[PDB]
Design a protein around this ligand. Structure first.
Ligand SMILES: CC(C)Oc1c(NC(=O)c2ccc(NC(=O)[C@H](Cc3c[nH]nn3)NC(=O)c3ccc(NC(=O)c4ccc(C#N)cc4)cn3)cn2)ccc(C(=O)Nc2ccc(C(=O)O)cc2)c1O
Ligand SMILES: [Mg+2]
Ligand SMILES: [Mg+2]
Lengths: 402, 517, 517, 402
DNA sequence: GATTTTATGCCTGATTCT
DNA sequence: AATCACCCGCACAGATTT
DNA sequence: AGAATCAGGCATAA
DNA sequence: AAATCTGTGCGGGT
């Protein structure tokens, strides 16, 4: 019942798969090496043995079918890991949050009921793809979002793109690639500090010259600096917000802060660029990038895409134009789940021995793992809530940003 | 075959699942009291133009559109969510007007998607008011192809009015309904005075108001729940004992039942209890509820007493239930336990922000329209030279350049501009080079393009006067919009007027009666 | 209650059912070779704008639209019909481009509606060409609310190339596939001479051509089928015997199997036959087909000859099959048995009708456009009186009446207005009162309204000359359309050019091989 | 077995229903009178006992359940019609072709296996409605299309409709109604013969006078009639048609060979008219109707419609306007099947003992019925094909012309 | 057009231990 | 998420009776 | 006699 | 040992 057995009888070359969803299991049954591979679809979420009792565990059908399929016993004085069929086991769940939840449930079951199986290293986790990209001739699969970003960046700078400053220089690859990588890293760093300061404040600081706090002292040049910053911010404002500046001489080094009134109708008291901000390394790297990102572009300039040309006046405009031009004849497909894939794709992505990729589960420490399982999967609400709160956004505020 | 520790995998997977369920599935938002699925369903229905005064549409169409475009989940959950909103005995104020078979209080179940039909309700359009005037922020969908609102610009206090119920990982939320008029009066009282205590607010809001119109017993639980955020209350059914003399035998008549109670299960439980001799003095049980109303009849034995047998039913049967009030909601993307004053303050701040953004958008649009109207009026003032110059134009670009590089006489229209002076109607982005400088208008590129797109039909007198009328009214509109932003009291006056209008439009009477022990 | 004889009721009911099934479900139409379900599905997909170079759509959307709007039957039949058209091993030229798990040659399965996607194919747009130019007849749907085409204006000979198969009450039909290039060559040969014999036609069309590329063993049944409409042919698989020397081993390799045969069932049948000792000399059986080709390997014993076992396999198992050609189709709403010449003649007549109707529609549109352009050109030559009249008038209605009241002198544009062929560029519905009279022009109401909608941008030289160029082009277009409608030889040239273009675009090579016994 | 038995045990006042489908079965169970009515849904088409062997009949689940529900035996030496249950049986199938097919299968089963049940008159056929009409207050159900047409015609002339021809005549009811009914009958007569001639020719011949065969001659008399008809046809076209004509003589009568062409380079080459056509009664009744239908409308004419006056000619447009006026406040619904009807409608339309309508099945002759059953439901294809072809549209082409 | 049983938290009533 | 158990005509093995 | 344990209901997701 | 009888599957419908 709901188990496609294999032909191999020796329990050292067989495999077993625990597929999520009936359609995915049906598709996988077609596209598999029928000699030494088996399938066992799971209709949905399964029993949690950590909270449930032994009698209810035996009463259920999914766990009972799994126990029958594995071939080993259950409980003390009957369990015997030597009588094991399907020496290799693969999970292969979906790539969404419910897939991770089902994976955690299966790991809890295997660890609590059959510790020796996990210890000996007979449990594997599969890594199905997420994106598929075709460009007429080339076709490939891409996992998660990071690899998609890397592929997009590489395709953007794939040939041509000889940037012209004044008449006809040529950065020609590596310099432009380094500049793009640095710009993306700085933007990623900026994106993770939106709560503390406005985006526009960080964006404008890169183009303006360095503050040079070493030679600032009390020359009163900070007043002109903040005035120019406020005027530049207000020049291209398109949201109705207004900006003002305030300065004082509480110490030897004069201090200043902006005041912003925004669409919310409430005014923030200050966003001070205090001693920590100027001494912080984030502003130092921002100024480092800005030093190379000054007004390098001359009166006449353009980007030399392959058999194409377009005048430009800003680096972001050139990047956007290159990205848009690189996405002309590119086709992309996104898989919502395992049920969207035909048997050939599943075979060549997850079930082919010569091109599949998997992870082996191993145990580092016993007491720590037992404590973690008891804390997370137990029937005690308060410890679980405290653990979730500890690793909440309060602990996500990493100040390294690197 | 890379290795991986079991502890790290378990930790990462469970934390990701818990965070996603907490911030994406179960708890509602304090500002509008809608879970993401409700917001996505309402937005999808709004985009299709399924208004409240048009033909119905099949449920399967809306469900499929919601699944395909915005919500990447199954069909059963979405259809059940849509069905629960259309039941008169589930929500205090229905948000979906349905036609078909959406179940019944007895315990039946609704039909499939293929047979039912739905459309938006009249009140629902108030939740999505001024949605197109840049009032709320938009965020990308799962595949980065669509835009969904981050929060609706609600005009109804939806959270208190409709309540909520949800189960998350490590926490849960449960809030009962309320009455609209009482909540609006409380909001106005808070607007008048911002230091009002809980006792002052409870003058206007005595307590909950369920759809089924049962009785609430006790008063300490409500006050404790409002003061702290956790409490317990007792809901008791409405029943009576009636006797017609003659034989001298009385009967118990039940008209109403508590909130979230099934009639069939209650009747079968009563039958089972009286079967096993666990309740004395009950002879016959019958249900005559049909169309006209709800009536459950219990005929007692000859030697029994109505009060004694009646009091045992509350102790044993499910005619009296306990409701546990527990208020939890998302404030700024994190869970928190709220009370009445915090909810009212959040609603008021939301309204202030929405009104400010709407005013800014309207001001920008009015100024942009007035800018083009000025150029059209100036061009019509000097039509003969304009056409004479255009006739000798080799191409439209040369005509546009000739029009731009030449001053023009204001003419008899300059007097109107004397009322439009003081730089009140000029766009912010416009430079001081253009516009009237020394009694000679200077045209821009877009103004010249608009002039070139002029039809002969507008050369008549009536069309000429309509532009002047439009300009004159736009000046007053711009003045009013400026005055609204020039002070803080006018904003509160506008908010009060809107709340009073909503109360007048959607007011109703109270159902549930509160009594002490 | 009223009595009724059983005989009359049985007769009427069964005759009604039989007549509904014969012309409602099973047999195809000769002109385009599509059953009603195929036509309804294709039209529904076309209306939604699901073209061949756009994003895919879920199968549930199309199925629901077809069920609700056009086809009042169950969903399983519609979905199976949609799935069958997307399989490369069922149709010679697929009509639907699918994505998902649509099954394989083993006859395994197909995923449900919520796990697949579909769109139109490139060739499928050739069937529905010139649908909007009033080339076919429309009929009401089952409730008198929609309109559906009576027949598609097909441009591909769909019936011969794709074949058909159907069962009815009292009759059936079964027609195999053919090759497109051969059929187009046959049609071109027929157009040059209508008295062509069957032997002449068979020079361009040797025989059927299945998708699977089997081998046809015989040549006598094809002639009988094409000469009388009924015949029988034999389809044989492709296999060979290869010897690697060493120990004198023999192995049988099977590449290509007949049409409509499942590989898994064939393998299981061979295994059952060798198991039960009914076929001697076979040792082992294996399958090794993976992504590159089909290969079935059979090993034979060292004390047997490969040829005998191969012939026994041909005679016993399903490696050799018989196919009975039986051509039946609807001619004018009645079944009829046909041969090749009748089908070709019907297709040619359909093309002639479609081309004639399209030409008439295009001529009407061109005449209307030229009629409007004449009025605009005449108005552009009297600018000063027109603007004076418009300015003096207070209302657009008064200006329109004043324009219509007086005639307008032609001016310098009289050279081209009189250069037309008298009444060639004049609408048929226009009265003789209006139009170019003796030395003056008379305007209608719609011409005056069009004049009032003119922009000032048209006063430039380039815009003025573009209208004259367009009018001159339209004169030549009208002349060409009239010449096409005039003689009966230009129509054949147009048909030949269209057929040649189709052959160049969608031609391909032959697959099946034909040999004598 | 999906059988909801009734409470009454006396087998002389019970009833049984064999509903088609599952939704209809559920609705019938909801809306039935539980005292003395039972339901038995059928999932789909049932076994054809005429072709099936005796052994396979008992194996099928549907017929086995039906036999068990009826209570009588099956086969010789066990069939016992005296010990019968459910003395009244109602079929109540859907109102489409599939319903008729299922009805024929059930009738075949009952006649072949239980002849005495059919002979004694224990089999009834229900007749649910098809159309529903609403007019605010007056709403009702209509069965079959002919009743719908009659209802529409009656509502079109329900009061008013005083045709003012020249100064002040008044048909006043019966005359107009009889004229309209006769015109509709003639239109139906034209429609049934629409295949053999164009619509325009038949529609125009009614306006023309009689052929006048008395003064017919080879020259100066034969040509005038055909030329007048062709001229009257040519000046009323919208599809680019063309009508031409020729005549000939064969020493007996002067025959016409009119020809027409439209949207085709081909030509039919003949639409002959001779003594046979004029001798036919169809032309006689056409002339009889056309004698009244002439150009009676003067320069001033109108119809005294309620709060409406539409002075126009071409009385067909007047009829269309009257139909539009009738449909102004009319709503029509067409049920797709028994599933659409709610339980109350099913209760009050066919299951109510005092408002339902049914048909009783009786046998006139035995040998004729047996031969018909063998011819139709037998496993011989040639007699069935011959019977279907004989009663095709050729038999429907009745030349009675009355 | 109809077809299973789980996770997640808080409250009740009913049954089982000492 | 694909499967239930029949009607319609045609051709062809493997299995019973003459 | 009174703590301790075991079921069932509620609303969005496999 | 020749002649009947008995099943299976193809594609649109309850
Ligand atoms: C849901 C889907 C199916 O369809 C829709 C619908 N649906 C309808 O509009 C519909 C469909 C059918 C009916 N039918 C009837 O009302 C009648 C009533 C009746 C009663 N008696 N006779 N007839 N029933 C039938 O005709 C019928 C036909 C066959 C039947 N049985 C069998 O065949 C059968 C019987 C026995 C056996 C056995 N052994 C086997 C079979 C029974 N009944 C009404 N409405 C609507 C919208 C959609 C839609 O747009 N979805 C969508 C959009 C976008 C997206 C996206 O974003 O990707 C996703 C999704 C849709 O997919
Ligand atoms: Mg999923
Ligand atoms: Mg039907």
């Amino acid at each position: 019942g709901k188990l496609a057995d294999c032909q191999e009888r020796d329990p050292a070359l067989s495999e077993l798969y625990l597929v999520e969803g009936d359609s995915a299991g049906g598709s996988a049954k077609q596209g598999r090496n029928r000699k030494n591979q088996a399938i066992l679809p799971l209709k949905g979420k399964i029993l949690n043995v950590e909270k449930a009792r032994f009698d209810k565990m035996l009463s259920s059908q999914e766990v009972a079918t799994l126990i029958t399929a594995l071939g080993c016993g259950i409980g003390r004085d009957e369990y015997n890991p030597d009588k094991l069929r399907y020496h290799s086991i693969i999970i292969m769940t979906d790539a969404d949050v419910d897939g991770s939840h089902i994976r955690t449930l299966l790991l809890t079951f295997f660890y609590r009921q059959m510790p020796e199986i996990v210890e000996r290293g007979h449990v594997y986790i599969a890594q199905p793809p997420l994106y598929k990209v075709k460009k007429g001739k080339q076709e490939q699969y891409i996992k998660d979002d990071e690899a998609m970003d890397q592929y997009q960046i590489s395709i953007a700078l794939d040939g041509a793109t000889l940037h012209t400053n004044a008449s006809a220089p040529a950065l020609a690859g590596e310099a432009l690639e380094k500049l793009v990588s640095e710009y993306n890293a700085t933007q990623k760093m900026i994106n993770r500090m939106e709560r503390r300061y406005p985006k526009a404040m960080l964006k404008e600081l890169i183009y303006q010259p360095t503050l040079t706090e070493a030679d600032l002292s009390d020359e009163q040049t900070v007043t002109r600096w903040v005035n120019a910053l406020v005027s530049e911010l207000n020049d291209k404002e398109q949201h109705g917000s207004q900006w003002k500046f305030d300065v004082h001489t509480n110490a030897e080094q004069n201090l200043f802060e902006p005041i912003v009134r925004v669409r919310t109708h409430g005014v923030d008291t200050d966003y001070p660029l205090d001693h920590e901000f100027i001494t912080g390394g984030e502003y130092r790297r921002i100024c480092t990038l800005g030093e190379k990102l000054r007004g390098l572009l001359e009166e006449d300039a353009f980007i030399e895409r392959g058999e194409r040309r377009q005048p430009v006046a800003s680096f972001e405009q050139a990047l956007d134009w290159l990205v848009k031009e690189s996405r002309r004849g590119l086709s992309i497909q996104r898989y919502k789940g395992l049920g969207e894939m035909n048997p050939e794709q599943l075979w060549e992505t997850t079930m082919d021995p010569e091109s599949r990729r998997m992870l082996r589960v191993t145990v580092k420490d016993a007491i720590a793992a037992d404590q973690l399982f008891t804390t997370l999967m137990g029937d005690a609400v308060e410890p679980r809530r405290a653990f979730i709160e500890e690793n909440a956004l309060k602990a996500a505020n990493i100040d390294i940003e690197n | 075959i890379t290795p991986v520790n079991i502890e790290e995998e378990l930790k990462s997977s469970y934390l990701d699942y818990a965070m996603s369920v907490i911030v994406g599935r179960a708890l509602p938002d304090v500002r509008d009291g809608l879970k993401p699925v409700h917001r996505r369903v309402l937005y999808a229905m709004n985009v299709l133009g399924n208004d409240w005064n048009k033909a119905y549409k099949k449920s399967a169409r809306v469900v499929g559109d919601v699944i395909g475009k915005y919500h990447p989940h199954g069909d059963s959950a979405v259809y059940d969510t849509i069905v629960r909103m259309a039941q008169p005995f589930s929500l205090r104020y229905m948000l979906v007007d349905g036609q078909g078979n959406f179940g019944s209080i007895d315990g039946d179940s609704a039909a499939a998607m293929r047979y039912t039909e739905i459309r938006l309700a009249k009140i629902a359009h108030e939740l999505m008011a001024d949605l197109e005037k840049e009032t709320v922020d938009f965020v990308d969908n799962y595949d980065g192809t669509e835009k969904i609102p981050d929060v609706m610009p609600t005009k109804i206090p939806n959270l208190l009015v409709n309540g909520s119920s949800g189960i998350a990982v490590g926490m849960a939320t449960n809030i009962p309904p309320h009455n609209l008029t009482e909540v609006i009066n409380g909001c106005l009282a808070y607007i008048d005075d911002e230091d009002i205590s809980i006792e002052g607010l409870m003058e206007h809001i005595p307590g909950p108001d369920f759809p089924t119109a049962a009785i609430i017993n006790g008063r300490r639980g409500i006050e404790e729940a409002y003061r702290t955020g956790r409490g317990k209350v007792y809901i008791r059914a409405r029943a009576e004992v009636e006797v017609d003399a003659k034989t001298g035998r009385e009967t118990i008549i039940v008209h109403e039942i508590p909130y979230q109670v099934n009639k069939a299960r209650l009747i079968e439980k009563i039958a089972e209890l009286v079967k096993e001799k666990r309740v004395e003095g009950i002879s016959a049980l019958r249900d005559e509820s049909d169309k006209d109303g709800m009536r459950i009849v219990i005929e007692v034995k000859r030697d029994a007493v109505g009060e004694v047998v009646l009091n045992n039913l509350y102790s044993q049967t499910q005619l009296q239930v306990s409701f546990g009030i527990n208020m939890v909601a998302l404030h700024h993307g994190q869970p928190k336990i709220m009370n009445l004053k915090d909810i009212i303050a959040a609603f008021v701040r939301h309204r202030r922000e929405v009104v400010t953004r709407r005013t800014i958008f309207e001001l920008r649009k009015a100024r942009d329209r007035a800018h083009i109207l000025e150029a059209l009026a100036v061009a019509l003032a000097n039509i003969d030279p304009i056409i004479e110059l255009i006739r000798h134009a080799p191409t439209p670009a040369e005509a546009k350049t000739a029009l731009v590089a030449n001053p023009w006489q204001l003419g008899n229209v300059a007097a109107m501009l004397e009322r439009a002076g003081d730089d009140a109607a000029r766009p912010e982005w416009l430079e001081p080079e253009f516009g009237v400088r020394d009694g000679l208008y200077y045209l821009t590129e877009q103004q010249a393009q608009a002039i070139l797109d002029l039809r002969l039909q507008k050369l008549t007198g009536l069309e000429h006067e309509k532009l002047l009328d439009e300009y004159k009214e736009l000046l007053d509109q711009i003045a009013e919009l400026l005055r609204i932003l020039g002070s803080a009291d006018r904003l509160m006056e506008v908010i009060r007027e809107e709340l009073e209008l909503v109360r007048e439009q959607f007011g109703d009477k109270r159902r549930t009666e509160i009594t002490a022990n």
